[PDB]
Each structure stands twice: as structure tokens, then as C-alpha cells.
Amino acid sequence: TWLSDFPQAWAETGGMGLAVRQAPLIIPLKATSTPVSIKQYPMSQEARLGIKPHIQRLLDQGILVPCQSPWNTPLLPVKKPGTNDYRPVQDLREVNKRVEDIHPTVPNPYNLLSGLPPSHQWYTVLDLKDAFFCLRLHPTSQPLFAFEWRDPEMGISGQLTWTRLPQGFKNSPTLFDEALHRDLADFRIQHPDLILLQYVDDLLLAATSELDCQQGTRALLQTLGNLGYRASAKKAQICQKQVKYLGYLLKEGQR
Amino acid sequence: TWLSDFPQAWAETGGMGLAVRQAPLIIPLKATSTPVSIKQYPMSQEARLGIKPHIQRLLDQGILVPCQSPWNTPLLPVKKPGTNDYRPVQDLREVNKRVEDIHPTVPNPYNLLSGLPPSHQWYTVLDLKDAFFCLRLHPTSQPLFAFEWRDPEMGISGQLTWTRLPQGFKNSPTLFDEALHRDLADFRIQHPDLILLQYVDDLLLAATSELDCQQGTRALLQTLGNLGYRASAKKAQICQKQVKYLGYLLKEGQR
DNA sequence: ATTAGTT
DNA sequence: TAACTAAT
DNA sequence: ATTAGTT
DNA sequence: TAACTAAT
Ligand SMILES: [Co+3]
Ligand SMILES: [Co+3]
């Protein structure tokens, strides 16, 4: 009854996340970075219609808001099947170029697994849904990610931007990790007898007894939901001795 | 009166050389080297006629002799002007490939000049004419350099080879150096007060006083001629304080 | 007449 | 992955 | 619609 | 010096 007891912990029934303990993130520019406004590319009506639903709900979620910036980058309609079913994808490459770098705190997977004792044979693997959107963007920096939203077949607005850390931003991964490591510190302390592996949106908890593993998973789920994060209950793995994580298959401590 | 007193020392009036103190050189093959016979390329009558004079005189000098080998490499007619005036040039590249390597004893020019004191401001520069031909080839190894000599416009012989170290052989330079260093050892000993720079065919003697420099040049010339070497009196430099050597201009010790 | 070798 | 230069 | 980047 | 693949 996991999905049951932790309603606010799952994306499926907890609703959009929002890391409240985190202060709006400010994105430092390079000393010589000056705004770049690239005009939106033409888009077949089918494509424009394909991404409309998303945009809409994002606006409704206050994740996208109307604005006016000297910045502006194109929006690209991508698909997976033959070519149907589109997804909005913004090309932030020029913004990334003008943004200030930061030290990659994220530990590569291999060494990340190094810190894993055989003593803990029980696993739980969670992955957060829309990890980035849980982190607020400081108003000052929000202008950097604006893009133009039109609709020749429906008058429609103009330029919109993000209010949360966006997809395609070269530092979202690193910025998110740091954030989560900060927010899961208290947990690590309150459960010295557990091993929490953290790699951005991908989490791994390991314990000695399947009993602990479960008690651990609850404290964790309770905490995640509490702090404002949501994990995909769908693709989740709870209390096992064989679990697939970061592309490695964990079996008794193999891979 | 230099050309005068050392007749046997100059190519111009000493005649072909022959290092007698040297034992016929044997060229060691690689463990897996098996003979290669490449058929001669067609040659315009003009070209064949252009190189005839040389060949002839080489045969007359006993430097080229008739033979019959399983080896055989093409002969190429090369020129310098627009394209007239040809010179026989043999392509020994395949033979070099099948010949055993040896340690490059020749010191590169730069470090070669390193061993040169400022105290010696007087220079003499000689260069040997047909350096390689002064070294005899052991009968056993002579077969390696055979090539086919025809003449559709004059019945003519067939296959001929060298009796002396040939041009285009990847080890002639090194083999020659060693030889000359061996033959000029006694001189170095008998004239501790001189500096002899040796780089294959290119020699440089240096002394303190222009007087020594001259006395030195004589002992040297007498020795060269004696041993069987000939220097091009033509392009020679005797007793100077500024002499061009190995591509460096020596002035008071510059370059 | 071929070739080792180099943006 | 598209010739060219020296050099034998 | 562009692009970093790789025999 | 002759395209192509992922990826935003
Ligand atoms: Co070049
Ligand atoms: Co590739």
C-alpha cells in the first residue's frame, strides 16, 4: 500500500512538485555575456497544435508566465514515433554559451557505486518526475529562458518564460543535485544505518534487512513528498535484492 | 698552390677514389628478406641515350660490372633543367626495405657544431667527390643492387650491378661516416691541436693560427689522397675565418 | 614509375 | 575521406 | 532549424 | 578536405 500512504510523494497523485526549502536560483552570466534574441522558426500548424496542450498546462501550473525579454530562443517540436506526437523542446544552446560555469559536483556513476557496502542487500530505487521544475528561478534570471509563443490560427499572446529551472539548461543537472543533497542531509543523519545513493533525479536506498529497507523507504517517501519532490510511482522499485540502477544491475552486489 | 701539391687529393686531378683500408662491406639482410626483382620500366630513346655516357664510364671504372641476380630494381632517368640532361637514378626503395638496419652513428649538425671552441678561428672546408664509390662492396652483397641495362637501339648486355657502395642506399651515409672516422683517427691523434668536424662527405678543420690551419690542411689533404679519398677542389674553402659549413655561416664563431 | 607521408 | 610533394 | 564534433 | 549523428 505504498502509493496509498504517501499521496504527496508520488507524481501520479501528489501533483506538481516545488522544492520550498530552496531559494530562487540566480544564474550568473559571464562577464561578457550580452543578450541574444533569436527569432522563432516557422512551424507547421500540426506541430504548433501538437505542443499546445503542454504549454497550456504549464501556464496553468504557473511554470510558464507571460513576459518581455531581450532574450529569446527558438522552440522546436520533437517527436518519437514515426513523427507524430510532438513535444516542445527549446534550443537553449546560445544561452548556455553566455552563462557562467560551475564546478560539476555530481559524482560519475562508477565511483558513486564505489561507496556501496555488500552488507546492504536490500534495495529501493526512485526517480523524481520533472525534477527540475521543483526548483524556482529567481525573477532576475527568469528572462534568460524566454521564448516566443504564437498561434497564427488563434491570435494568441507572444513571449513567455519559465518560473522554474528548465530542461536543456547546461547546469540544471548540477544545480538540482546540490539542491537535493542539501535537502536530504537531515534524512542521512536520522538514518545512519542506511545508504542513500544520489545521482540527480535517480535515487537509491540500501539497507541490511528488508524490514529496515521498508521503514527506510517510508521515511524517505514521507520526506520527499514533504520537501516538495515527486517520484514516478510508475517506474519505481521497492525493497528488492535485485534492482536496475543507473544502468547497472544490482544483484547481491554485482555490477 | 694547393691543387698543385696534392694531385691525388683532388677529384679534379686525382682520379676516382677507393678507400683501400676498408674491407668490402657486407650488407646484412633481415631474417625474412627474400629477393625482389622488379622489371625495368620503359624508357624513351632520348632518356636511354641521356644516361648512356655515365653507365659507360662507370663500367670502364669497374664500378659497374656485368652480372646475374634474382634481385633487380628499376633505373629512372632524372633531370634538373626544363627536363633535358638526364642522370641515372636507381630506385632502391624495395632493397632498403629488405635490408637490416644499423645504429645511426652520424651526429646531427647542431650537436656536431657544439664541439667547436672559439679559440679556433681559422677554417677549411672540404667535401669529398663521389664519397660512396670509395667504399668497396663485398661480392656476396653486390647482387642486391643489380639493375637491368638494355638498349633496343644497340643490342646491348642485360643485368649489371655495383662493386662499390651505391647512391640511394639507406645506409651508405652511415656506413661511410664510420669508415671515414676510422680512417681519420690517426690524423686526429697526430694533430691534437686541430679540430676536425666530420659529417659524412662534409669535413671541417679548424685551427688557432692561419699558419697551423694551412699546415693542417696539407697533412689532411695528403692523408685523404693517401687513404683513397678525393675532395672537390672546385667547391672548396681553404683557411678562412668565415666559411659556410653544413648550412651554417661560420664567422668568428657565429651560427 | 612509384611512393612515403601530410590538412 | 580529397591530392600532392619530394624522393628514390 | 541548427550544431558540436568525429575517419 | 568529404557528411552525419545526436542533441538542444
Ligand atoms: Co607538406
Ligand atoms: Co561517431
As a whole number of angstroms, the distance between CA A222 and CA B254 comes to 84
Residue B155 falls inside a structural domain: yes
Largest Cα separation within chain A, whole Å, is 63
Q: Domain count for chain B, please give it.
A: 2
Residue B40 falls inside a structural domain: yes
Query: Residue type for B47, please?
Result: A
- The nucleotides of chain F lying under 7 Å from a protein CB are 8
Count the residues in chain A: 255
Same domain (yes/no): B45, B84:
yes
Percent helix, percent strand, percent coil in chain A, to nearest 5:
35, 25, 45
Same domain (yes/no): B114, B70:
no
Same domain (yes/no): B59, B91:
yes
Same domain (yes/no): A109, A224:
yes
In the reported structure, the alpha carbon of residue B202 is separated from the centroid of ligand 1 by a whole-number distance in angstroms of: 28
What's the CATH number where A115 sits? 3.30.70.270
How was this structure determined? It was done by X-ray
As a whole number of angstroms, the distance between CA B180 and CA B137 comes to 16
Closest nucleotide to B92's CA, by C1' atom? Answer: D8
Same domain (yes/no): B224, B107:
yes
Q: Which residues pair with B126 in a beta bridge?
A: B203
Pairing of strands B159-162, B64-66: antiparallel
Which residues form the domain of B46? 29-98+143-164
| Protein-nucleic contacts, chain A 84-123 to strand F, CB < 7 Å | 89-93, 96
Stated in angstroms, how far is A162 CA from F3 C1'? 37
Same domain (yes/no): A36, A130:
no
**Residue B66, phi then psi, degrees to nearest 5:** -70, 150
Residue B255 falls inside a structural domain: no
| Protein-nucleic contacts, chain B 50-79 to strand D, CB < 7 Å | 76, 78
Same domain (yes/no): A92, A198:
no
| Helix intervals (H) in chain B | 2-5, 11-14, 45-60, 93-98, 109-114, 172-183, 185-190, 210-227
- Give Cβ neighbours of residue A154 (< 8 Å, ≥ 6 apart): none
Residue B216 falls inside a structural domain: yes
In the reported structure, the alpha carbon of residue A15 is separated from the centroid of ligand 2 by a whole-number distance in angstroms of: 41
Same domain (yes/no): B84, B159:
yes
Q: How many CB atoms lie within 10 A of CB A236?
A: 17
Kindly state the cell numbers that stand for B150. Answer: 638494355
Same domain (yes/no): A55, A8:
no
Same domain (yes/no): A210, A184:
yes
Nucleic acid strand E within 7 Å of A76 CB: yes
Same domain (yes/no): B11, B22:
yes
As a whole number of angstroms, the distance between CA B40 and CA B35 comes to 16
Whole-angstrom Cα Rg for chain B: 20
Residue B189 falls inside a structural domain: yes
Cell 511554470 identifies what position? A63
As a whole number of angstroms, the distance between CA B32 and CA B97 comes to 11
Residue A255 falls inside a structural domain: no
No. of helices (H) and no. of strands (E), chain A: 8, 11
Q: Which residue, among A138, A145, A143, A164, has the nearest Cα to A18 in the 3D structure?
A: A164
What's the CATH number where A39 sits? 3.10.10.10
Nucleic acid strand D within 7 Å of B91 CB: yes
Same domain (yes/no): B6, B56:
no
B174 vs A3, A131, B104, B161, B216, CA distance in Å? Answer: 84, 71, 6, 21, 26
